[PDB]
Structures are given as structure tokens and as C-alpha cells.
Short mmCIF file of C-alpha atoms in Angstrom, two decimals:
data_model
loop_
_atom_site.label_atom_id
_atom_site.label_comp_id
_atom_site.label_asym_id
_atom_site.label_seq_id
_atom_site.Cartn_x
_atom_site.Cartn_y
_atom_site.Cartn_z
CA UNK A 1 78.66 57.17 87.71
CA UNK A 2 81.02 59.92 86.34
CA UNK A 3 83.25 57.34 84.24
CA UNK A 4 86.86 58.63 83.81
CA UNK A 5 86.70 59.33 80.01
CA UNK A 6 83.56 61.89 80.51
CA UNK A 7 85.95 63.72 83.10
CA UNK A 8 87.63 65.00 80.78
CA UNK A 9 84.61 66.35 78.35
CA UNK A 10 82.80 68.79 81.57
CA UNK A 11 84.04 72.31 79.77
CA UNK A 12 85.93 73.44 76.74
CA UNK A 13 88.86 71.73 75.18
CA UNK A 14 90.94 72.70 72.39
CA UNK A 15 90.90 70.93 69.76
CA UNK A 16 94.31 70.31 67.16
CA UNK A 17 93.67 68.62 63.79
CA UNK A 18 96.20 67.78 60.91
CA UNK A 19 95.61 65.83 57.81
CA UNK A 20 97.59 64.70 55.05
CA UNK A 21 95.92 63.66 51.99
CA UNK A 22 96.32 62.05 48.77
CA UNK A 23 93.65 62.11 46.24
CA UNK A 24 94.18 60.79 42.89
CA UNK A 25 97.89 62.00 43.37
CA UNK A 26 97.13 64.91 44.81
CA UNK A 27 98.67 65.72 47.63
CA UNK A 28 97.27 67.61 50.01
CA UNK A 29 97.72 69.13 54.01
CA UNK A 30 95.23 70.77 56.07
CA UNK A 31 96.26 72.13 59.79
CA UNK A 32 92.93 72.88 62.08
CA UNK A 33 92.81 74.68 65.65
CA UNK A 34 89.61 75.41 67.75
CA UNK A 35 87.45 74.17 70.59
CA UNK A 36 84.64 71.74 71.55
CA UNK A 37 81.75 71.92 74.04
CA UNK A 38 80.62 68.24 74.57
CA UNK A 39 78.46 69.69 77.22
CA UNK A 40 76.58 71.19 74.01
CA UNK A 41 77.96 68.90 71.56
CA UNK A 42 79.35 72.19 69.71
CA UNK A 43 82.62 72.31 67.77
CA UNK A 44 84.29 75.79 66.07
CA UNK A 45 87.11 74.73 64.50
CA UNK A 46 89.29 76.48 61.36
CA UNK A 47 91.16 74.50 58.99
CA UNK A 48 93.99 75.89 56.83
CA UNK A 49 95.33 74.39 53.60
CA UNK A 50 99.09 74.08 54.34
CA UNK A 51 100.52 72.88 50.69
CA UNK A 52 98.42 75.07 48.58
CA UNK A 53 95.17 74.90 47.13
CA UNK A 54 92.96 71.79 47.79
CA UNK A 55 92.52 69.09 45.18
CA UNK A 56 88.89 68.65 46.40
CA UNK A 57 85.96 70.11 47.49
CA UNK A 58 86.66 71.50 51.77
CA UNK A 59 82.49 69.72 52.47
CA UNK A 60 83.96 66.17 51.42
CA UNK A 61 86.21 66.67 54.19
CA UNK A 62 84.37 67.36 56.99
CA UNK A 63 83.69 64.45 57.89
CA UNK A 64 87.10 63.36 57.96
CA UNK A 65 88.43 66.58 59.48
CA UNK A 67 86.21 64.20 66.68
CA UNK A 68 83.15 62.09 67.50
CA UNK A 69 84.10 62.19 71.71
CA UNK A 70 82.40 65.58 71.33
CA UNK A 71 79.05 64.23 71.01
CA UNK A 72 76.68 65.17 73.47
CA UNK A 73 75.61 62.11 75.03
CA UNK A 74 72.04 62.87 77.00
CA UNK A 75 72.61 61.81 80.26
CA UNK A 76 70.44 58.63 80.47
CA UNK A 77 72.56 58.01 76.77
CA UNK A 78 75.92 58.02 79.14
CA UNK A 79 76.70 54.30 78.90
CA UNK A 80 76.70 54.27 75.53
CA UNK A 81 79.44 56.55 74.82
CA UNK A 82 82.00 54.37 73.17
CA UNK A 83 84.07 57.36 72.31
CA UNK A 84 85.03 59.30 75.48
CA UNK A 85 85.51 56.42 77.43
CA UNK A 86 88.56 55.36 75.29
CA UNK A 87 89.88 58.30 76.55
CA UNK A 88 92.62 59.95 77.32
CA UNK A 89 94.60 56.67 75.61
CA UNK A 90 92.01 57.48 72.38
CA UNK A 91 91.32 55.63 69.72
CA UNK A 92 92.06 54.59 65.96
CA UNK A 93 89.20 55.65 63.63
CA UNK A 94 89.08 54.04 60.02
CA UNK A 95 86.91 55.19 57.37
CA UNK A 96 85.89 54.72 53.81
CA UNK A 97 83.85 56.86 52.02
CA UNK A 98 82.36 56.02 48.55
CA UNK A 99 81.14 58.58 46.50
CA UNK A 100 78.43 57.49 43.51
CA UNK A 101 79.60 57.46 40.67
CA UNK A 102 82.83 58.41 41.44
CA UNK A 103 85.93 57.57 43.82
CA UNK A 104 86.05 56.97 47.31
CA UNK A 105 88.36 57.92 50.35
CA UNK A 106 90.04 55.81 52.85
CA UNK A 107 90.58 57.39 55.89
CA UNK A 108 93.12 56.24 59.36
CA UNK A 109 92.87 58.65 62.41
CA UNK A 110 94.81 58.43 65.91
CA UNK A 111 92.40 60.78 68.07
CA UNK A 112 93.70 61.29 71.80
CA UNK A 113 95.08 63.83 74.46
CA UNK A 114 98.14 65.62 74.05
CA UNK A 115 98.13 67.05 77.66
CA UNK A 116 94.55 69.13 78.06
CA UNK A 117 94.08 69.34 73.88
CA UNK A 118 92.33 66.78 72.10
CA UNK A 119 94.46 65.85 68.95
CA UNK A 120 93.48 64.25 65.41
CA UNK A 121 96.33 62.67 63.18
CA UNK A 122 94.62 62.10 60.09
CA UNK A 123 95.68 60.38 56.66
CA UNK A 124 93.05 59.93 53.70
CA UNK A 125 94.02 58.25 50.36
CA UNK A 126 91.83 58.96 47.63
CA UNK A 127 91.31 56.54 44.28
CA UNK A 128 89.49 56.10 41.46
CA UNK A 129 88.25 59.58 40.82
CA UNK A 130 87.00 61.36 37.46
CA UNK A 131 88.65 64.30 36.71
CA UNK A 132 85.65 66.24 35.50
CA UNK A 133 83.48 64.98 37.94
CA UNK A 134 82.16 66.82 41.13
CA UNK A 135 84.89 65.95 43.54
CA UNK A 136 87.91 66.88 41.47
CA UNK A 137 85.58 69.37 39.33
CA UNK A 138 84.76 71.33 42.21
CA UNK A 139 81.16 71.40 41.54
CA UNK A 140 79.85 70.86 44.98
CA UNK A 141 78.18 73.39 46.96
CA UNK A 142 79.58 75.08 50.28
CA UNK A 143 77.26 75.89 52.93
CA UNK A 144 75.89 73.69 54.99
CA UNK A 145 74.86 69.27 55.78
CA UNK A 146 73.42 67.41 58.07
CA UNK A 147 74.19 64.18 59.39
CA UNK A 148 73.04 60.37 61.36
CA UNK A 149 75.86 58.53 61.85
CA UNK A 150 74.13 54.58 63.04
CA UNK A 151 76.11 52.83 65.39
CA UNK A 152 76.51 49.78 66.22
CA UNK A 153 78.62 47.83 68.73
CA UNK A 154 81.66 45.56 67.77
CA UNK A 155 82.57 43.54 70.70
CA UNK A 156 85.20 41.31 68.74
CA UNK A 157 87.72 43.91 68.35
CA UNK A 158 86.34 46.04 71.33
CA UNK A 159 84.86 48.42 69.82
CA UNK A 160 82.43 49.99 67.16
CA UNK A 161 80.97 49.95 63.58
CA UNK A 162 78.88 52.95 62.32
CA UNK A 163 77.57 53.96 58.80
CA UNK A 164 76.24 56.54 57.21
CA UNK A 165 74.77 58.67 54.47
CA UNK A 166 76.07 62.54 53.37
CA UNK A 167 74.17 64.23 50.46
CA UNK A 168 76.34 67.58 49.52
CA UNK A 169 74.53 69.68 47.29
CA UNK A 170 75.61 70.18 43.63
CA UNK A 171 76.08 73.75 41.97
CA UNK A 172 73.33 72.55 39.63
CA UNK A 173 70.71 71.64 42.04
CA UNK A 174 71.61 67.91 42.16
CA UNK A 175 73.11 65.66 44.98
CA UNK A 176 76.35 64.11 45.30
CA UNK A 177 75.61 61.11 47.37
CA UNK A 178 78.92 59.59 50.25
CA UNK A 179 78.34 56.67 51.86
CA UNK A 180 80.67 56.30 55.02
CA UNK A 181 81.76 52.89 56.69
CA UNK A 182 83.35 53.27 59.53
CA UNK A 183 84.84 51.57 62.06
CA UNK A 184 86.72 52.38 65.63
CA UNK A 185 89.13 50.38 67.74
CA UNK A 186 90.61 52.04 71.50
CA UNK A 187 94.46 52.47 71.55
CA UNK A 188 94.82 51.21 75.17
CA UNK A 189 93.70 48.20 76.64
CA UNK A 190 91.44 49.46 79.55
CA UNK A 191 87.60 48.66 79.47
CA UNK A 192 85.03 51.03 77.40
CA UNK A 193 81.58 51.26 76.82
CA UNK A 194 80.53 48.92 74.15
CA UNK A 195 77.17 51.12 73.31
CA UNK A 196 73.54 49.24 72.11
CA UNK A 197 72.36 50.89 68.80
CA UNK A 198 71.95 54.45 68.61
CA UNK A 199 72.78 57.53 66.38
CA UNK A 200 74.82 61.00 66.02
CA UNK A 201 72.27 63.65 64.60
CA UNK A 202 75.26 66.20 63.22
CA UNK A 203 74.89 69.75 61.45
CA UNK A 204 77.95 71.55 59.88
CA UNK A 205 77.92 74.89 59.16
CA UNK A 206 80.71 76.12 56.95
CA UNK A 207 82.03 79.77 56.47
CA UNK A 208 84.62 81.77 55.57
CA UNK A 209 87.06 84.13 57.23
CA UNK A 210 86.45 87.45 55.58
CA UNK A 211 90.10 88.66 56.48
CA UNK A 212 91.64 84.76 55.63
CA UNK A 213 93.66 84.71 51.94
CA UNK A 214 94.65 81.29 52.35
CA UNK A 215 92.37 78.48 51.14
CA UNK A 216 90.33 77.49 54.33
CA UNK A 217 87.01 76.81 56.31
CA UNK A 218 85.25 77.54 59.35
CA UNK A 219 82.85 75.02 60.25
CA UNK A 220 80.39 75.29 63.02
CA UNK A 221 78.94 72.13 64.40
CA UNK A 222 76.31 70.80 66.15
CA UNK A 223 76.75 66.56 67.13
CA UNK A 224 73.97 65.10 69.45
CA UNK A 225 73.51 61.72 70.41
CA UNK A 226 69.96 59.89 69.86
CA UNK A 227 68.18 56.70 69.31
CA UNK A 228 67.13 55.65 72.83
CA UNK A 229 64.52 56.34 75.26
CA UNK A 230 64.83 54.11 77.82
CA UNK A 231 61.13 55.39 79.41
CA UNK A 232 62.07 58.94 79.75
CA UNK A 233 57.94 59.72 78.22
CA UNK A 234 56.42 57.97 81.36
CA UNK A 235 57.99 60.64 84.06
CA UNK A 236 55.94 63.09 82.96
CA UNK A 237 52.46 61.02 83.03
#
């Protein structure tokens, strides 16, 4: 059946963002307005830095800076954890280490503000160099790709989910973030506890040619993946 969470996912919604951030005491705000398409799992979004110039690199954010819209195939549908906490939403924690250097911890209300889809993020960032490639700026701006596992968490009704992100160093090397994650609904109405599966993600980032502030557009692509559940034998 059409559960009430994917209701609200048929067509386009806006999409608000706002972060404030704190790396290495740094402090940091980025504001972010555009649109997703879970029917195509596609997101444009831009993102603004509101208190000046960022502290860090705008591709160690992206992952930070809306997960309910993935597009779920439909024979996928039962497993989507994330629009079926919806419209209540859900709390999203993260932490992301980076080799060799510091890590992020991340807390994220996501839910509906009338028709727009609304992320209240803070990050806290510790522990990093000052000439390495986060606060050095030495990371490359273009374009990742992404599969976020996940897993269920029935004790706090929920899910778990990790992953690897490998941003590409002006030198030609790799700056490797490994993201723990974990997500928790806000109300206390049933959702989809989901078997194993992944998100296959691509970001695209660009600039605004007529933008002077310090900002990024990001393009992305999210697609959920991982089961087949016989969809080969139809076809002989």
C-alpha cells in the first residue's frame, strides 16, 4: 500500500537547510534552499555561508548538509525507514572520522514545516591539524560518490548505517571519511524497520557564476539498492 509517509514524497518539495558549525573553534553557518524529486531521487539545493568564509572544505559537508529523498524502487517500498517517519521526522546523528585527522559530530532534526521539508543541523568538529587537508583546504571540489549500508535498529526503533567518502586531494591523493550514523523517529507512530540494503549517492558540486558569497550548488543523485527480491525471474 501507499503508506502515509510516501504521500508526501509523489512530486517536488522544497527543501530548507541551516547548519551551525563549530570546527576546531571555528564557527561557522550555512543557510540552504532548493527542491527534491524522490520520484527521481534528485536534489538541487544551494547553500550560502552566512558568518563569512568557511573554516573547511564545502565537499566535507555534504554529507551533513535529507536521506527521505531516496528513491526507493517500488518493490524496495517497505524498507524505507526514512519517509515513513514522516511528517513527525526524525533525529539523525552522525560522526565522521577523517584519517589522519579530526572528525565531526553531527545532530539533525529533519521534518515538515507545512509542505517544506526542513533540516536543523549542528556539527562540532575536534581534533583537527591545522595544516592538514580539512583546515588546509587542500581537498578537491567537483564531484563523489556514495553507499551508505543500512542496517535496521529495532531497539531504539530505528536505523544504523555506515559508510565510506574518498574526496580527492589537490595532489592526486585521497582524503578518506568514515561515517557512523545512526537515526531515531521524533514521534511515536510505527515505521518501517528496513532489512539490509544501500543508498548509491552522486554529488555534483558547482558554482554560481553570478554568486560573491562563499557557496555551493550541489546536484544529487540518491537511489536505493541492495535487494532483489526475484525481480530477474519475470522476465524468463
Amino acid at each position: 500500500m501507499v503508506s502515509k509517509g510516501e504521500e508526501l514524497f509523489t512530486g517536488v518539495v522544497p527543501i530548507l537547510v541551516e547548519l551551525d558549525g563549530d570546527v576546531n573553534g571555528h564557527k561557522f553557518s550555512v543557510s540552504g534552499e532548493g527542491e527534491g524529486d524522490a520520484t527521481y531521487g534528485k536534489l538541487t539545493l544551494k547553500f550560502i555561508s552566512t558568518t563569512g568564509k568557511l573554516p573547511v572544505p564545502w565537499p566535507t559537508l555534504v554529507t551533513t548538509l535529507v536521506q527521505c529523498f531516496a528513491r526507493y524502487p517500488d518493490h524496495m517500498k517497505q524498507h524505507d525507514f526514512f519517509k515513513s517517519a514522516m511528517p513527525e521526522g526524525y533525529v539523525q546523528e552522525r560522526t565522521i572520522f577523517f584519517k589522519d585527522d579530526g572528525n565531526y559530530k553531527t545532530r539533525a532534526e529533519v521534518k515538515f514545516e507545512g509542505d517544506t521539508l526542513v533540516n536543523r543541523i549542528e556539527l562540532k568538529g575536534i581534533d583537527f591539524k591545522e595544516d592538514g587537508n580539512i583546515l588546509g583546504h587542500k581537498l578537491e571540489y567537483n564531484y563523489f560518490s556514495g553507499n551508505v549500508y543500512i542496517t535496521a535498529d529495532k531497539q531504539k526503533n530505528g536505523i544504523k548505517a555506515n559508510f565510506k567518502i574518498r574526496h580527492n586531494i589537490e595532489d592526486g591523493g585521497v582524503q578518506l571519511a568514515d561515517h557512523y550514523q545512526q537515526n531515531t523517529p521524533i514521534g511515536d507512530g510505527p515505521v518501517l524497520l528496513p532489512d539490509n540494503h544501500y543508498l548509491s549517492c552522486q554529488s555534483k558540486l558547482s558554482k554560481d557564476p553570478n554568486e560573491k558569497r562563499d557557496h555551493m550548488v550541489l546536484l544529487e543523485f540518491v537511489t536505493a539498492a541492495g535487494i532483489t527480491l526475484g525481480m530477474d525471474e519475470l522476465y524468463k
